[PDB]
CSV table of C-alpha atoms in Angstrom, one decimal:
chain,number,residue,atom,x,y,z
A,1,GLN,CA,109.1,18.9,-138.5
A,2,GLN,CA,111.9,21.4,-139.3
A,3,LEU,CA,113.8,21.8,-142.6
A,4,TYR,CA,116.8,23.3,-140.9
A,5,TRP,CA,117.7,20.5,-138.4
A,6,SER,CA,121.5,20.2,-139.2
A,7,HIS,CA,124.8,22.2,-139.9
A,8,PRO,CA,127.8,21.1,-142.1
A,9,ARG,CA,130.0,18.3,-140.7
A,10,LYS,CA,132.5,17.5,-143.6
A,11,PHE,CA,135.7,18.2,-141.5
A,12,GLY,CA,137.0,18.7,-137.9
A,13,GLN,CA,136.0,17.1,-134.6
A,14,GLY,CA,132.3,17.2,-135.6
A,15,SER,CA,132.9,14.7,-138.5
A,16,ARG,CA,134.7,11.8,-136.7
A,17,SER,CA,134.1,9.6,-133.6
A,18,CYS,CA,135.3,6.3,-132.1
A,19,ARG,CA,134.0,3.0,-133.7
A,20,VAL,CA,133.6,1.2,-130.3
A,21,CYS,CA,132.2,3.9,-127.9
A,22,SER,CA,131.3,7.1,-129.9
A,23,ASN,CA,133.7,9.4,-128.0
A,24,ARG,CA,135.4,12.4,-129.8
A,25,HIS,CA,138.7,13.0,-127.9
A,26,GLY,CA,142.1,11.4,-128.4
A,27,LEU,CA,141.3,9.1,-131.3
A,28,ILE,CA,143.8,7.4,-133.7
A,29,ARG,CA,143.5,8.0,-137.5
A,30,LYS,CA,146.7,6.0,-138.3
A,31,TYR,CA,146.5,3.0,-140.7
A,32,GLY,CA,142.6,3.3,-140.7
A,33,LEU,CA,142.1,2.3,-137.0
A,34,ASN,CA,139.6,5.1,-136.0
A,35,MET,CA,139.6,3.8,-132.3
A,36,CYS,CA,139.8,6.0,-129.2
A,37,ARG,CA,143.3,5.8,-127.4
A,38,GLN,CA,141.7,4.1,-124.3
A,39,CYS,CA,139.9,1.6,-126.6
A,40,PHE,CA,143.1,0.8,-128.6
A,41,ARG,CA,145.1,-0.2,-125.4
A,42,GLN,CA,142.1,-2.5,-124.7
A,43,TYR,CA,141.9,-4.3,-128.1
A,44,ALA,CA,145.6,-4.1,-129.3
A,45,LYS,CA,146.3,-7.9,-128.7
A,46,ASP,CA,143.2,-9.0,-130.7
A,47,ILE,CA,144.1,-6.6,-133.6
A,48,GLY,CA,147.6,-8.1,-133.6
A,49,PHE,CA,150.0,-5.4,-132.2
A,50,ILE,CA,152.6,-6.4,-129.6
A,51,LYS,CA,155.4,-4.7,-127.6
A,52,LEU,CA,159.1,-5.8,-127.6
A,53,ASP,CA,161.0,-2.5,-126.9
B,1,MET,CA,102.1,10.6,-136.5
B,2,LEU,CA,105.0,8.2,-135.8
B,3,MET,CA,105.2,7.0,-139.4
B,4,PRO,CA,103.0,6.4,-142.5
B,5,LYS,CA,101.3,3.0,-142.5
B,6,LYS,CA,103.2,2.3,-145.9
B,7,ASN,CA,106.5,2.4,-143.9
B,8,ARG,CA,105.3,0.3,-140.9
B,9,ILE,CA,104.1,-2.6,-143.1
B,10,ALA,CA,107.5,-2.6,-145.1
B,11,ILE,CA,109.5,-3.0,-141.8
B,12,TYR,CA,107.2,-5.9,-140.5
B,13,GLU,CA,107.1,-7.8,-143.8
B,14,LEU,CA,111.0,-7.7,-144.1
B,15,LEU,CA,111.3,-8.8,-140.4
B,16,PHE,CA,108.8,-11.7,-140.9
B,17,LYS,CA,110.4,-12.9,-144.2
B,18,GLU,CA,114.1,-12.8,-142.9
B,19,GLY,CA,113.5,-13.8,-139.2
B,20,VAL,CA,116.2,-11.2,-137.9
B,21,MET,CA,117.0,-7.4,-138.1
B,22,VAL,CA,120.2,-5.3,-137.8
B,23,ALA,CA,120.6,-1.5,-137.5
B,24,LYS,CA,123.2,1.0,-136.3
B,25,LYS,CA,122.6,3.5,-133.4
B,26,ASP,CA,122.4,6.7,-135.6
B,27,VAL,CA,119.1,8.6,-136.0
B,28,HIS,CA,120.4,10.9,-138.9
B,29,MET,CA,121.2,8.6,-141.9
B,30,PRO,CA,118.4,9.2,-144.6
B,31,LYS,CA,117.8,5.5,-145.7
B,32,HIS,CA,118.1,2.1,-144.0
B,33,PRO,CA,120.3,-0.2,-146.3
B,34,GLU,CA,119.1,-3.4,-148.1
B,35,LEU,CA,115.3,-4.1,-148.9
B,36,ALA,CA,114.3,-1.0,-146.9
B,37,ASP,CA,115.3,1.0,-150.0
B,38,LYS,CA,112.2,2.6,-151.6
B,39,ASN,CA,112.3,5.2,-148.9
B,40,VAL,CA,112.2,4.5,-145.1
B,41,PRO,CA,114.8,6.0,-142.7
B,42,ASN,CA,116.5,3.9,-140.0
B,43,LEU,CA,115.0,6.1,-137.2
B,44,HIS,CA,111.6,4.5,-138.2
B,45,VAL,CA,113.3,1.0,-137.9
B,46,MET,CA,114.7,1.8,-134.3
B,47,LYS,CA,111.3,3.2,-133.2
B,48,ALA,CA,109.3,0.3,-134.7
B,49,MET,CA,111.5,-2.4,-133.2
B,50,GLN,CA,111.4,-0.7,-129.7
B,51,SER,CA,107.6,-0.9,-129.8
B,52,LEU,CA,107.8,-4.6,-130.8
B,53,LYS,CA,110.3,-5.4,-127.9
B,54,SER,CA,108.1,-4.0,-125.1
B,55,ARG,CA,105.2,-6.3,-126.2
B,56,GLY,CA,107.5,-9.3,-125.9
B,57,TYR,CA,107.4,-10.1,-129.7
B,58,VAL,CA,111.3,-9.8,-130.3
B,59,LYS,CA,114.6,-10.3,-128.4
B,60,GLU,CA,117.3,-7.6,-128.5
B,61,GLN,CA,121.2,-7.5,-128.3
B,62,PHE,CA,123.7,-4.7,-128.7
B,63,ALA,CA,127.5,-4.4,-129.4
B,64,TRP,CA,129.8,-1.7,-130.9
B,65,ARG,CA,127.1,0.8,-132.1
B,66,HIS,CA,124.8,-1.9,-133.6
B,67,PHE,CA,121.4,-3.4,-132.5
B,68,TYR,CA,120.5,-7.0,-133.3
B,69,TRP,CA,116.9,-8.3,-133.1
B,70,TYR,CA,115.5,-11.9,-133.3
B,71,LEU,CA,111.9,-12.8,-133.9
B,72,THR,CA,110.1,-15.2,-131.4
B,73,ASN,CA,107.0,-17.5,-131.4
B,74,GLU,CA,104.5,-14.9,-129.9
B,75,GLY,CA,105.8,-12.4,-132.5
B,76,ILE,CA,105.4,-14.9,-135.4
B,77,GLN,CA,101.7,-15.4,-134.2
B,78,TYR,CA,101.1,-11.5,-134.1
B,79,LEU,CA,102.8,-10.7,-137.4
B,80,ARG,CA,101.0,-13.5,-139.4
B,81,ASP,CA,97.7,-12.0,-138.1
B,82,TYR,CA,98.8,-8.3,-138.9
B,83,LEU,CA,100.1,-9.2,-142.4
B,84,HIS,CA,96.9,-11.4,-143.1
B,85,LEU,CA,99.1,-14.4,-144.3
B,86,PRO,CA,97.8,-18.1,-144.6
B,87,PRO,CA,98.2,-19.9,-141.2
B,88,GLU,CA,100.6,-22.6,-142.7
B,89,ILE,CA,103.5,-20.2,-143.7
B,90,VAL,CA,106.9,-20.0,-141.9
B,91,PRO,CA,109.2,-18.3,-144.5
B,92,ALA,CA,112.4,-17.5,-142.6
B,93,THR,CA,114.0,-20.7,-140.9
B,94,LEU,CA,112.6,-24.3,-140.9
B,95,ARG,CA,115.1,-27.1,-142.1
B,96,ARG,CA,116.9,-29.1,-139.3
B,97,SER,CA,120.7,-28.8,-139.3
B,98,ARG,CA,123.4,-31.6,-139.2
C,1,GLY,CA,67.7,-22.9,-145.6
C,2,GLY,CA,69.0,-20.6,-148.4
C,3,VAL,CA,72.0,-19.4,-150.5
C,4,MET,CA,73.4,-16.1,-152.1
C,5,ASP,CA,71.3,-13.8,-149.8
C,6,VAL,CA,71.9,-10.0,-150.2
C,7,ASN,CA,73.9,-9.8,-146.9
C,8,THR,CA,76.6,-11.6,-148.9
C,9,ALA,CA,77.1,-8.2,-150.7
C,10,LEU,CA,77.2,-6.3,-147.3
C,11,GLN,CA,79.4,-8.7,-145.1
C,12,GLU,CA,81.3,-11.4,-147.0
C,13,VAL,CA,82.6,-9.5,-150.1
C,14,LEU,CA,83.1,-6.4,-147.9
C,15,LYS,CA,85.2,-8.2,-145.2
C,16,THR,CA,87.2,-9.8,-148.1
C,17,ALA,CA,87.9,-6.3,-149.6
C,18,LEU,CA,89.4,-5.0,-146.3
C,19,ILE,CA,92.2,-7.7,-146.4
C,20,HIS,CA,93.3,-6.0,-149.6
C,21,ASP,CA,92.8,-2.4,-148.2
C,22,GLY,CA,90.1,-1.7,-150.9
C,23,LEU,CA,87.7,0.5,-148.9
C,24,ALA,CA,87.0,4.3,-148.7
C,25,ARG,CA,85.3,5.0,-145.3
C,26,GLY,CA,83.0,8.0,-144.6
C,27,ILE,CA,82.0,11.1,-146.6
C,28,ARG,CA,85.2,12.8,-147.9
C,29,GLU,CA,87.1,9.5,-148.8
C,30,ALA,CA,83.8,8.3,-150.5
C,31,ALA,CA,83.4,11.5,-152.5
C,32,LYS,CA,87.1,11.5,-153.6
C,33,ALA,CA,86.7,7.7,-154.5
C,34,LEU,CA,83.7,8.6,-156.8
C,35,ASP,CA,85.4,11.7,-158.5
C,36,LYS,CA,88.5,9.8,-159.4
C,37,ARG,CA,87.1,6.8,-161.5
C,38,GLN,CA,87.7,4.1,-158.9
C,39,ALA,CA,84.3,3.3,-157.3
C,40,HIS,CA,82.9,-0.3,-157.8
C,41,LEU,CA,80.2,-0.7,-155.0
C,42,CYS,CA,78.5,1.8,-152.5
C,43,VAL,CA,76.7,1.3,-149.1
C,44,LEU,CA,74.5,3.9,-147.3
C,45,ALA,CA,73.0,4.1,-143.7
C,46,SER,CA,69.9,6.0,-142.4
C,47,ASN,CA,69.8,9.8,-141.9
C,48,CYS,CA,72.2,10.7,-138.9
C,49,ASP,CA,73.7,14.1,-137.9
C,50,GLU,CA,73.0,15.9,-141.3
C,51,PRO,CA,69.9,15.5,-143.6
C,52,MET,CA,71.8,17.3,-146.6
C,53,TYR,CA,74.2,14.4,-147.5
C,54,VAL,CA,71.2,12.1,-148.2
C,55,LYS,CA,70.6,14.2,-151.3
C,56,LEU,CA,74.4,14.6,-152.1
C,57,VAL,CA,75.6,10.9,-152.1
C,58,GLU,CA,72.6,9.7,-154.2
C,59,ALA,CA,73.2,12.6,-156.7
C,60,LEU,CA,76.9,11.7,-156.8
C,61,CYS,CA,75.8,8.1,-157.8
C,62,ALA,CA,73.5,9.6,-160.5
C,63,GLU,CA,76.7,11.5,-161.8
C,64,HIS,CA,78.3,8.0,-162.3
C,65,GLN,CA,76.6,4.5,-161.9
C,66,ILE,CA,74.1,3.6,-159.1
C,67,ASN,CA,76.0,0.7,-157.5
C,68,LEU,CA,74.1,1.6,-154.3
C,69,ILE,CA,73.0,-1.0,-151.6
C,70,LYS,CA,70.9,0.0,-148.6
C,71,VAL,CA,71.1,-1.0,-144.9
C,72,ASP,CA,69.8,1.6,-142.5
C,73,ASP,CA,71.6,0.5,-139.3
C,74,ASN,CA,74.5,3.1,-139.0
C,75,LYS,CA,76.2,1.0,-136.2
C,76,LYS,CA,76.3,-2.2,-138.3
C,77,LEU,CA,78.5,-1.4,-141.3
C,78,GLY,CA,80.8,0.5,-138.9
C,79,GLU,CA,81.0,-2.7,-136.7
C,80,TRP,CA,81.6,-4.9,-139.9
C,81,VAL,CA,84.5,-2.6,-141.2
C,82,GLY,CA,85.5,-1.5,-137.7
C,83,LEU,CA,88.9,-3.3,-137.2
C,84,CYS,CA,91.7,-4.6,-139.6
C,85,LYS,CA,93.1,-7.3,-137.1
C,86,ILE,CA,91.8,-11.0,-137.1
C,87,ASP,CA,90.4,-11.0,-133.5
C,88,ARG,CA,88.8,-9.2,-130.5
C,89,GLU,CA,87.2,-6.5,-132.7
C,90,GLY,CA,84.1,-5.5,-130.6
C,91,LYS,CA,85.7,-3.5,-127.7
C,92,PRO,CA,83.6,-0.3,-126.7
C,93,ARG,CA,86.8,1.8,-127.1
C,94,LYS,CA,85.9,1.5,-130.9
C,95,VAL,CA,82.6,0.3,-132.6
C,96,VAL,CA,82.0,3.8,-134.1
C,97,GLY,CA,79.2,4.6,-136.6
C,98,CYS,CA,80.0,4.9,-140.4
C,99,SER,CA,77.3,6.6,-142.5
C,100,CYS,CA,78.7,5.6,-146.0
C,101,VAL,CA,81.3,3.2,-147.5
C,102,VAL,CA,82.7,3.0,-151.1
C,103,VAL,CA,84.8,0.1,-152.6
C,104,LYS,CA,87.7,0.8,-155.0
C,105,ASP,CA,89.0,-2.8,-155.2
C,106,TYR,CA,86.6,-5.7,-154.3
C,107,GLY,CA,89.5,-8.0,-153.2
C,108,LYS,CA,89.9,-11.8,-153.8
C,109,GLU,CA,87.2,-13.5,-156.0
C,110,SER,CA,85.1,-16.5,-154.8
C,111,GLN,CA,81.8,-18.4,-155.5
C,112,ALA,CA,80.5,-15.4,-157.6
C,113,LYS,CA,79.6,-13.8,-154.1
C,114,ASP,CA,80.4,-10.3,-155.6
C,115,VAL,CA,78.0,-10.8,-158.6
C,116,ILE,CA,74.8,-9.9,-156.7
C,117,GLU,CA,75.1,-6.2,-157.7
C,118,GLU,CA,76.1,-7.2,-161.3
C,119,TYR,CA,72.8,-9.1,-161.5
C,120,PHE,CA,70.8,-6.3,-159.8
C,121,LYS,CA,72.2,-3.8,-162.5
C,122,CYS,CA,70.1,-5.9,-165.0
C,123,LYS,CA,67.2,-7.2,-162.7
C,124,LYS,CA,66.2,-3.8,-161.1
D,1,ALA,CA,150.8,-23.7,-174.1
D,2,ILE,CA,153.1,-22.7,-171.1
D,3,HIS,CA,153.4,-19.2,-169.4
D,4,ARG,CA,155.8,-17.4,-167.0
D,5,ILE,CA,153.5,-17.1,-163.9
D,6,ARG,CA,154.1,-15.4,-160.5
D,7,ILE,CA,152.9,-16.3,-156.9
D,8,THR,CA,153.2,-13.9,-153.9
D,9,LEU,CA,152.8,-14.8,-150.2
D,10,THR,CA,152.4,-12.6,-147.1
D,11,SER,CA,152.0,-13.0,-143.3
D,12,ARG,CA,152.9,-11.6,-139.8
D,13,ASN,CA,154.3,-15.0,-138.5
D,14,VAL,CA,157.7,-16.1,-140.2
D,15,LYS,CA,157.9,-19.8,-139.5
D,16,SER,CA,154.5,-20.8,-140.9
D,17,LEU,CA,155.4,-18.9,-144.1
D,18,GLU,CA,158.7,-20.9,-144.3
D,19,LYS,CA,156.9,-24.3,-144.3
D,20,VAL,CA,154.2,-23.0,-146.8
D,21,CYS,CA,156.9,-21.7,-149.2
D,22,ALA,CA,159.2,-24.7,-149.0
D,23,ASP,CA,156.2,-27.0,-150.0
D,24,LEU,CA,155.5,-24.9,-153.1
D,25,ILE,CA,159.1,-25.3,-154.2
D,26,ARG,CA,159.1,-29.1,-153.7
D,27,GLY,CA,155.8,-29.7,-155.7
D,28,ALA,CA,157.2,-27.6,-158.6
D,29,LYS,CA,160.7,-29.2,-158.6
D,30,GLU,CA,159.5,-32.9,-158.6
D,31,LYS,CA,157.3,-32.0,-161.7
D,32,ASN,CA,160.2,-30.2,-163.5
D,33,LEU,CA,158.4,-26.8,-163.6
D,34,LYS,CA,161.8,-24.9,-163.5
D,35,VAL,CA,160.9,-22.7,-160.5
D,36,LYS,CA,162.8,-19.5,-159.7
D,37,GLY,CA,163.8,-19.3,-156.0
D,38,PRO,CA,162.0,-17.3,-153.2
D,39,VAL,CA,162.7,-13.5,-153.4
D,40,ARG,CA,162.6,-11.9,-149.9
D,41,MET,CA,161.3,-8.4,-150.1
D,42,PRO,CA,162.2,-5.9,-147.3
D,43,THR,CA,160.2,-6.3,-144.0
D,44,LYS,CA,157.5,-3.7,-143.2
D,45,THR,CA,157.0,-2.4,-139.6
D,46,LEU,CA,153.8,-0.6,-138.3
D,47,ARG,CA,154.3,1.5,-135.0
D,48,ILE,CA,151.9,3.2,-132.5
D,49,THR,CA,153.1,5.1,-129.4
D,50,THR,CA,150.6,6.1,-126.7
D,51,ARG,CA,150.5,7.5,-123.1
D,52,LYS,CA,149.8,4.6,-120.5
D,53,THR,CA,147.4,6.7,-118.3
D,54,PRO,CA,143.6,6.8,-119.0
D,55,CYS,CA,143.2,10.2,-117.3
D,56,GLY,CA,146.4,12.4,-117.6
D,57,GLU,CA,147.8,12.1,-114.0
D,58,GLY,CA,151.2,10.7,-112.8
D,59,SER,CA,154.8,10.6,-114.1
D,60,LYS,CA,154.7,10.7,-117.9
D,61,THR,CA,155.2,7.0,-119.1
D,62,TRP,CA,154.5,5.7,-122.7
D,63,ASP,CA,153.6,2.4,-124.4
D,64,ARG,CA,155.3,1.4,-127.8
D,65,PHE,CA,153.2,-1.0,-129.9
D,66,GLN,CA,154.4,-2.6,-133.2
D,67,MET,CA,153.3,-5.1,-135.9
D,68,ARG,CA,155.7,-6.7,-138.5
D,69,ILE,CA,154.8,-8.0,-142.1
D,70,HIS,CA,156.8,-10.5,-144.2
D,71,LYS,CA,156.5,-10.8,-148.0
D,72,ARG,CA,157.8,-13.3,-150.7
D,73,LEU,CA,157.7,-14.0,-154.5
D,74,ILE,CA,158.2,-17.2,-156.5
D,75,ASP,CA,158.1,-17.5,-160.4
D,76,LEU,CA,157.1,-20.7,-162.4
D,77,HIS,CA,157.5,-21.8,-166.1
D,78,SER,CA,154.2,-23.9,-166.6
D,79,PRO,CA,150.6,-24.1,-168.0
D,80,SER,CA,147.8,-22.1,-166.4
D,81,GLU,CA,146.0,-25.4,-165.6
D,82,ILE,CA,148.6,-26.8,-163.1
D,83,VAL,CA,149.3,-23.7,-160.8
D,84,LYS,CA,145.7,-24.3,-159.7
D,85,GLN,CA,146.8,-27.8,-158.5
D,86,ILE,CA,150.0,-27.0,-156.6
D,87,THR,CA,148.7,-23.7,-155.1
D,88,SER,CA,146.0,-25.7,-153.0
D,89,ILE,CA,148.0,-27.9,-150.6
D,90,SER,CA,149.8,-27.1,-147.2
D,91,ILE,CA,148.2,-23.5,-147.3
D,92,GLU,CA,146.1,-24.2,-144.1
D,93,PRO,CA,147.9,-21.6,-141.8
D,94,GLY,CA,147.1,-17.8,-141.6
D,95,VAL,CA,149.2,-16.9,-144.8
D,96,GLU,CA,147.9,-14.8,-147.7
D,97,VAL,CA,148.5,-16.4,-151.2
D,98,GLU,CA,147.9,-14.4,-154.5
D,99,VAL,CA,148.8,-15.4,-158.1
D,100,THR,CA,148.9,-13.5,-161.4
D,101,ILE,CA,148.7,-15.1,-164.9
D,102,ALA,CA,151.6,-13.1,-166.5
D,103,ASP,CA,154.5,-11.0,-164.9
D,104,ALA,CA,157.7,-12.5,-166.6
E,1,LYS,CA,123.4,22.1,-113.6
E,2,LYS,CA,121.2,24.9,-111.8
E,3,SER,CA,117.7,25.9,-110.8
E,4,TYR,CA,115.8,27.4,-113.8
E,5,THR,CA,114.6,31.0,-114.2
E,6,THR,CA,111.4,31.1,-116.3
E,7,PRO,CA,110.3,32.9,-119.5
E,8,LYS,CA,106.9,34.9,-119.6
E,9,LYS,CA,105.5,34.7,-123.3
E,10,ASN,CA,104.1,31.2,-122.5
E,11,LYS,CA,102.3,28.7,-124.9
E,12,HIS,CA,102.5,24.9,-125.1
E,13,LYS,CA,101.2,24.7,-128.7
E,14,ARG,CA,98.3,26.4,-130.6
E,15,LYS,CA,94.7,25.0,-130.8
E,16,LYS,CA,93.5,23.6,-134.2
E,17,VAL,CA,90.0,24.8,-135.1
E,18,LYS,CA,87.0,22.3,-135.4
E,19,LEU,CA,84.6,22.5,-138.3
E,20,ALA,CA,82.0,20.2,-140.1
E,21,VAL,CA,83.3,18.1,-143.0
E,22,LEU,CA,82.1,19.2,-146.4
E,23,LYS,CA,80.6,22.4,-148.1
E,24,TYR,CA,82.3,22.2,-151.6
E,25,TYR,CA,79.3,20.5,-153.4
E,26,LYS,CA,75.7,21.7,-154.0
E,27,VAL,CA,72.5,19.9,-155.2
E,28,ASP,CA,70.5,22.5,-157.1
E,29,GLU,CA,67.7,20.3,-158.7
E,30,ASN,CA,66.9,16.6,-158.5
E,31,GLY,CA,70.0,15.0,-160.2
E,32,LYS,CA,71.8,18.4,-160.8
E,33,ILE,CA,75.3,18.9,-159.1
E,34,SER,CA,77.5,22.0,-158.8
E,35,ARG,CA,81.2,22.1,-157.6
E,36,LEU,CA,81.7,25.3,-155.6
E,37,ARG,CA,85.5,25.5,-155.3
E,38,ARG,CA,88.0,24.5,-158.1
E,39,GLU,CA,90.7,21.8,-158.7
E,40,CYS,CA,94.3,22.9,-159.4
E,41,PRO,CA,95.8,22.4,-162.9
E,42,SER,CA,98.0,19.5,-162.0
E,43,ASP,CA,99.3,15.8,-162.5
E,44,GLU,CA,98.3,14.0,-159.2
E,45,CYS,CA,95.9,16.6,-157.8
E,46,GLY,CA,93.7,16.9,-161.0
E,47,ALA,CA,90.4,15.6,-159.5
E,48,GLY,CA,88.4,15.5,-156.2
E,49,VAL,CA,90.7,18.0,-154.4
E,50,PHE,CA,90.1,21.7,-154.1
E,51,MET,CA,91.9,25.1,-154.0
E,52,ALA,CA,91.1,27.4,-151.0
E,53,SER,CA,89.5,30.8,-151.6
E,54,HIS,CA,91.2,33.6,-149.6
E,55,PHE,CA,90.4,37.4,-150.0
E,56,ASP,CA,93.0,37.9,-152.8
E,57,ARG,CA,94.3,34.3,-153.7
E,58,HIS,CA,93.5,30.7,-154.8
E,59,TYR,CA,95.8,28.2,-153.0
E,60,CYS,CA,96.3,24.3,-153.1
E,61,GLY,CA,96.6,22.9,-149.6
E,62,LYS,CA,98.0,19.6,-150.9
E,63,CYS,CA,100.8,21.1,-153.2
E,64,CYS,CA,101.4,23.4,-150.2
E,65,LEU,CA,104.9,24.8,-151.1
E,66,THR,CA,103.4,26.2,-154.4
E,67,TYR,CA,100.2,26.3,-156.6
E,68,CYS,CA,99.1,29.8,-155.6
E,69,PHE,CA,97.2,32.2,-158.0
E,70,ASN,CA,97.1,35.9,-157.2
E,71,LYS,CA,93.3,36.4,-157.8
């Protein structure tokens, strides 16, 4: 088994991914959510966000 | 080799004692948490529990990047044999709820 | 009838030592188990495949203590040690030969069944 | 001996926090604990704005999601042994309650 | 997403050589033993385990990243 089997991943789009579905594009870092934008519109009611305006 | 026999016994003894297992779907983290300290990676836990599922000795569930496993009666029979324990032991769950 | 026959030192203590992983099996494990000061009991088959080791394993006991018991059936001690599971041991996909065995730990004590060789070290 | 002792409450929903807070004032007033009235802190609003489409096609509409958080303070003049009594009844709804042994 | 055009320096893996088990001990007289290849000066590997002999080196196969002597 190899000793060089990974590359640094301490910043950028290689570091972070969605907590529900493991995707890397269009994720929300605001308030500590770390969901994908399509997964957020799916769970927003259970998390406690609403729309009024 | 898949893993040293020292690792394989430490997964099965923790599974038999606790009655359940939990792990995340990531092959790269160097240590499984909890009583799998003293050096076994969670890649060995995923690969060990997969081999135990296809024999019928555990049930499996999955949600949000985590596996869940439950031990069952044929698996209790097989692990009590493999670990050489006395035939009277059932260490995980026994007392009737109210 | 009878009691405490020498097969007790070749089957019942030996099967008990396997439950505690105490055995070294075959030549290079056995030699390494004699060189590091771990050996407690030794078993040796008839001449199979190589006449030279029959000199060597006896001489390696003379370099230490002659805890050596003899059973010439090369298939039998291999059959007795031959699987770690409780059941269905005898399948022809296993049942290999095993020319020599050495014990590091003798396992759980009972009925003085291990003491045959401790008597033989004063009686022989 | 007595202390000056401070309780803080927090929730999303307003009208459950009103009934929780009113009951803490009554239990202190009937036992003469000389309670200082509920201080309303400014409201906090969280906002997220997202495209509605899952795939990037169509006319360019947006969704505007928000969450609102409400916070209060009450101060008491009493022993440390009796805040433990009154801070244990009517607290059943989804309201945070926190207390600190000296702040006044 | 295509048909594949093949390389031409082909191996699957190497073949590991097969040899009989033990030649590191000698009986010279009745009850006289010699050890033909040496142990390495070490904490865990100090007994029953041997250094290779090459044409210009002695090497420990167990401590494999190190324990090499240049004669």
